[PDB]
Design an enzyme around this catalytic site. Structure first.
Site, PDB file in Angstrom:
ATOM      1  N   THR A   1       4.413   6.281  -4.549  1.00 56.64           N
ATOM      2  CA  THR A   1       3.091   4.674  -4.553  1.00 56.64           C
ATOM      3  C   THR A   1       3.521   4.949  -6.099  1.00 56.64           C
ATOM      4  O   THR A   1       3.121   5.390  -7.131  1.00 56.64           O
ATOM      5  CB  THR A   1       2.469   4.689  -4.285  1.00 56.64           C
ATOM      6  OG1 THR A   1       2.541   3.933  -2.544  1.00 56.64           O
ATOM      7  CG2 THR A   1       0.817   3.883  -5.065  1.00 56.64           C
TER       8      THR A   1
ATOM      9  N   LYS B   1       1.164  -4.066  -1.930  1.00 51.71           N
ATOM     10  CA  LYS B   1       0.059  -3.398  -2.322  1.00 51.71           C
ATOM     11  C   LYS B   1      -0.672  -3.323  -3.543  1.00 51.71           C
ATOM     12  O   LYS B   1      -2.027  -2.859  -4.484  1.00 51.71           O
ATOM     13  CB  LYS B   1       0.854  -1.574  -3.039  1.00 51.71           C
ATOM     14  CG  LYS B   1       1.570  -1.210  -1.674  1.00 51.71           C
ATOM     15  CD  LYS B   1       2.018   0.189  -2.266  1.00 51.71           C
ATOM     16  CE  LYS B   1       2.924   0.745  -1.307  1.00 51.71           C
ATOM     17  NZ  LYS B   1       4.027   1.870  -2.414  1.00 51.71           N
TER      18      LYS B   1
ATOM     19  N   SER C   1       1.984   8.369  -6.895  1.00 51.90           N
ATOM     20  CA  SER C   1       2.796   9.543  -7.395  1.00 51.90           C
ATOM     21  C   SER C   1       3.294   9.333  -8.225  1.00 51.90           C
ATOM     22  O   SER C   1       4.015   9.616  -9.379  1.00 51.90           O
ATOM     23  CB  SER C   1       3.225   9.757  -5.675  1.00 51.90           C
ATOM     24  OG  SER C   1       3.987   8.848  -5.481  1.00 51.90           O
TER      25      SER C   1
END
Ligand SMILES: [K+]
Ligand SMILES: [K+]
Ligand SMILES: [K+]
Ligand SMILES: [K+]
Ligand SMILES: [K+]
Ligand SMILES: [K+]
Ligand SMILES: [K+]
Ligand SMILES: [K+]
Ligand SMILES: [K+]
Ligand SMILES: [K+]
Ligand SMILES: [K+]
Lengths: 173, 173, 173, 173, 173, 173, 173, 173, 173, 173, 173
Positions: G1, G33, G125
């Site tokens: 992500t 998101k 990440s």
């Protein structure tokens, strides 16, 4: 596995169960874990693999041959090699050896163990159950070494899930 | 994997399934886990890596060449090398070998195992299911070694997730 | 533990071994793991603690009473309470129940389950060995359900270190 | 386990295999992993324990009752409870729910996942194999939702060791 | 990585993605994982390091030369050297080779392996996704082998985080 | 550690930070991680121990010498030895090498990696931060290879706790 | 992500990729998101589960409502509850919130982080790859906040195997 | 095991317990862990296997012979061989040697070590308990070295589960 | 710890050692692990903490009181609560209870265990050594229950490093 | 993080670095970790999250108010609430507070603690490096408390990877 | 940490060192580990966290208030809560409490331990060294409780790395 030895009234006996296990299952139930060595003058019991046993019994016989048949001396020499040879160090097991003079446990961790005054030795996962029963019998009955070994192996077989009741028992003389 | 061997009425049969599982998926479905070795006089089956197995089969044939084709002696010698050699210790697997006289399981942990009186041996994740079915059939039917092996492999296949229905069955007439 | 049930020719049998283990040792070798419930009309076998079994069997009886002897409905409700109540959820035992109509396995994690066309069910660590032997016997012999359960329990007791050969076998004639 | 759902031409199908694996053996082979919920207006499939799943299905129906049958709202509310409740956090599994409007995956790790434009969802150890086959079939054939689900479950079954060929396929006409 | 090969209507195709990963990050996205060997007559795909691949492909060519273009014999010998030499044993790459006659997978641990009747082979972490998509396409469409490989690589690249969508595809017309 | 290389308008640069860490502390902050090899015609950066670096740079020079100064050929040969020599296999590190023709990453896991079309390479714990910054700069500015390397190392130094801002930068020609 | 935010010349942007992963596979590639909160006056990006996101965005809106729309004050209050509420403590995630005044990262470990003077924030990440690229772009180009966010997300998507290139970007005003 | 030595008023004493343990069980309770070497002039105690001890003591005697009774020089050379030879390196025993001049501890990992001004030395798992008791007794009583060793061994045997109360005590008057 | 009970010729005895250990050291050597309950009509031995023992003995007395002094019924009820009460589930221990009618082991894992026909029970780390010795004595001597318990505890104390020889023995009547 | 305080010649100083880390990467490099409380009369430094710090500092102020500026009494009560409330117990920050009278460290696990005669206190991962440098400077130079804190923070920032060199230093003149 | 208590000639003394070690460094050196509780009529020492200890001391005083100041009853009641309470189970430590009648160790694992006839108790990493020295001194000198405690703490301090020479000694006249 249960191997137990008792020496009483001039007789020495070594006996063991017959179970070989892999994880939580039985691979074989009639293994012979006790053999006669050195022209049938020495009794030997082993807790470990058969091939491992053959390699170690083979060397112990070579020790007896070069050390005039002295059990203790031969045992210490075997232990020294077992403890330091890179090949032998891979063999995980415990052994009990007995002749007309004395009985000994030989390990791969640099130790050779003599019995207490009761002259009983035991190895294997169920060894301490046979040891407990054997000491009770030796200290409280007049039973023969052979009878105690048989009764002790049976008691260990009823407690240890890795020990069964198919015995191999050798006596000397 | 399931490899099972039965000896009855002069016939010796070794069979296995064909599934090779990588992780938790079917890598291959038609593996050949049983092979004829030593000029077709020996049957050998393996539970473990194909490359690892082929390495051990070759080494076993050299042991047979070395010891006049005696199965037990050769198996014990293979087990000893497997137990100590740096490279062979990295080889994970279990083996079943059989000739016209005897059958044995060879392991990399110092064990060479002979079958009980039923003369049946089984290895692999599904080995004990085939062992149970084979023992039931040997003790309660007049089926041949070949039929028992096929029926035992099939029963193991319905229970073990890593065992196939594609069998390779070899027999020593 | 090994509990196995076979239904054949109008006969249903449930039998189990008698070993109770703690770690790798045996606490009891003569446990009765199969009981007659509902005034003898229901055979029930269990793998687990006796207190857990008493709890689950008393709760099962209550349900059989309110479902007028209907095994499946009683079992489905039992499994419902089992996963519903925080108290019951702590019970890890596994059960096999059988009446003249059907045989079922009940567990706290998998609810109720029925057998395949061969009508064999097994639970306990040695269960699959008994299942493999039983399937071989049903498919290849004319043996009665009692004979098959006795022989399958024996085969499993010879392979599984947590199953012994002291059996309790109940039959609904 | 493999559960796959496809929506096409007004039809919504959810299907799964029937294998329940205990350890690495086939516990059961005819499990019913897809069920109709909410007066038959909702299809739900699960990858995980049967008891765990039934607990979550019941809770979901209560959420549907609470939120006027709106699938997404109810799924998000279930995911929130599943994420925080002490007992529910011990419940390991993944769920697929579908009604006539939408399809969703619900997890116990704070996720509610909607499918991509292909309108396909899959869960379980073999889920991604069914997903791959379903996507290939939706994008390259005119097969119905039902046919794609059956064919995808079968492809997953030849690859995943824990997935069966015994399917339960439910559809919302 | 995902490498997949399909053989259909006299055409054989091998294609792969281009992602090279170290841990959870991408070192390269345009790697060519499929090469033409033996003067264009052999297609070869590999999952593994480029140095490993260079080593194995140069060794494979040598064998093809001495086996006059026989793929299977050349592959069997390659696998033999692979498990024989301590140097080669360190190579963990996986290979797929295909000529106008047959397609095979070769690995250092599993020797040589052939496809099922559908003639699809796949390797790499995303392999089984490509395999599932390819099997669905072969069994349900008339698409060419090139079309199937391209579409299967794409499906796998959309599921596997270690496979991307930059493909290299070679065909033997 | 961060080593990054950029090639732009006929210039190739390799630069690195100076931090050597042990656990969560700094052993040295001014290490020189980039050196000039082969009569100053090759730039080499290493992420790993100094002694390890010397052994590998030493061998790479021997490769250049016997392989006519061909970087790729020399790199593949170094990788092969590094991947298979029991001594070299103990050296854990990553290297970047560049000459007037091309740039490469050499690893000890049988891989030699060429850059994408942007001709940027980076290794070390902070390598991907320099890589991200370098690609942004190459794709969006006219800055020189030297300036991008300097700015990229700085950005990596402000993010990675194991990379500092004491740089060593070599350019060719 | 990867979620990244840049504020430049009176404009603030928050953008993210669309990949939701489970282990090493993709569950969804088009997740949204980034959302607009508080009557579209606040931008919010989250790295974590959707249900988890809804619970936390919901509470943050309640904070804005009772704290006069003060972002920092509302953020600190949300963090305090998230850090200490037994229910909220189960939610593992990171958030980025921005309004016309400032930008903040909110964590569940009792921290609220303000950006450096460059006003760039990133989580997930792949967040540090976008951060590196963003800082390079902000410090070396005149590109808009929107363009930098788009280019930074792309660079992160080409490096992080858990970040894809399907973006959702919101701007304010 | 607990071995302790005290030197006071011209008397030096070395004493130890008699327990030999394997895991958490006792193999022997009457082991003699203190021996008289060099024709009675040297007291030697050991924690470790008897085979290891025999090896190290025979090697130590040889050195005492060539160093004309010099304990320190003999011990320093012993420790040198101990860490030098690959065979001896496998010996993990710990030793305490004492003559009329000085007392020392020798181990394979820590070479030779001398006591503090109180001249107390201890080895074995229970060593520090004996050391603590001995230091208290030397500093606060007029007890002889024999009395202190006997009382310290007892205190240690009452705390350490691997030390018993069957002591062997030797004194150099 | 070792607790053992024998019932012979109308007498029942429960005895235990006195060692309380923490890791590999002794915290106390004279603990009283056997008590008289229910107006001195019940003997109770416990392997576990004293406070834990008091809580459980307290509840068992409450059970006796409400269940007319029925040992088995009271034991099963205690086990049910111990197995399911969140508070009691934290108590790790094993208990032996005996009255003039029978003897039982109560565990916290839903089990209540009755003795074999020899009426001997044993718990604790050294319990199986006392059990082995007790069975040997019961089956081969005429010794009283009290004498066997005393001799069995002693044998267990000489083998188990966690069992000592400071006994507490209660007899009934 | 590194926070250090030195009191010398009537001056007390508290200073800290500015690095905020998540795993092995930096989220912020200009954090202000030292604040002035109680209208400027109290210096407070913290290692931990900003939300945690805000909570603890607001609670500390309240206490200073009710204890009329008494630092020790205020700190002791703060620590009491810290270990008392389940909400506060979740806060893991570490604090250093100092006024014109005394300096103290307060943590949730160790309550309140005072400095040694040198009046230096330090917290944070780099704390002990700063402490070592500060002790050397106090004991061997005439440097002011401000100079010592600045130099000690620098020494720690050069060794600890989680501490940087962007300091915030406050002094009570 | 080392806490030791001795009772002799009507005097009861409890003392401890002052070292608090964080990781493997000296967090604090003058901790006060022994305190007077219950209106100065009780002495309490702790091995473990200061906050944890203070929590348990407060709870113990409430138990004393509850049970008329009876030490054993109160200790057993504290041990029961400590054993089951969710928050208290997270509190790791061991306690020593003493009043004018008796002394006890309280643990969080269901144990309340009374001293042997020597009336000495010790806890902490260095507890057994102080125990050994105290037992030697009580059995062999006429020193007072206070002197023995001080001398035992000092001996423990020279052996245990976590024990200080800064003692807090409390006595009940
Ligand atoms: K047994
Ligand atoms: K199968
Ligand atoms: K058995
Ligand atoms: K399958
Ligand atoms: K991908
Ligand atoms: K840095
Ligand atoms: K990516
Ligand atoms: K002891
Ligand atoms: K003992
Ligand atoms: K630093
Ligand atoms: K110390």
């Amino acid at each position: 596995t249960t191997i137990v030895s008792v020496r009483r009234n001039g007789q020495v006996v070594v006996g063991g169960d017959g179970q070989v296990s892999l994880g939580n299952t039985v691979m074989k139930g009639n293994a012979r874990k006790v053999r006669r060595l050195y022209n049938g003058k020495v009794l030997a019991g082993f807790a470990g693999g058969t091939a491992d046993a053959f390699t170690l019994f083979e060397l112990f016989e070579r020790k007896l041959e070069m050390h005039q048949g002295h059990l203790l001396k031969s045992a210490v020499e075997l232990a020294k090699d077992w403890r330091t040879d890179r090949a032998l160090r891979k063999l995980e097991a415990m052994l009990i050896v007995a002749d007309e003079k004395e009985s000994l446990i030989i390990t791969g961790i640099g130790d050779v163990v003599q019995p207490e005054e009761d002259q009983i030795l035991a190895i294997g996962s169920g060894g301490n159950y046979a040891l407990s029963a054997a000491r009770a019998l030796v200290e409280n009955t007049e039973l023969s070494a052979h009878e105690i070994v048989e009764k002790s192996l049976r008691i260990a077989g009823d407690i240890c899930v890795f020990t069964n009741t198919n015995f191999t028992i050798e006596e000397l003389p």
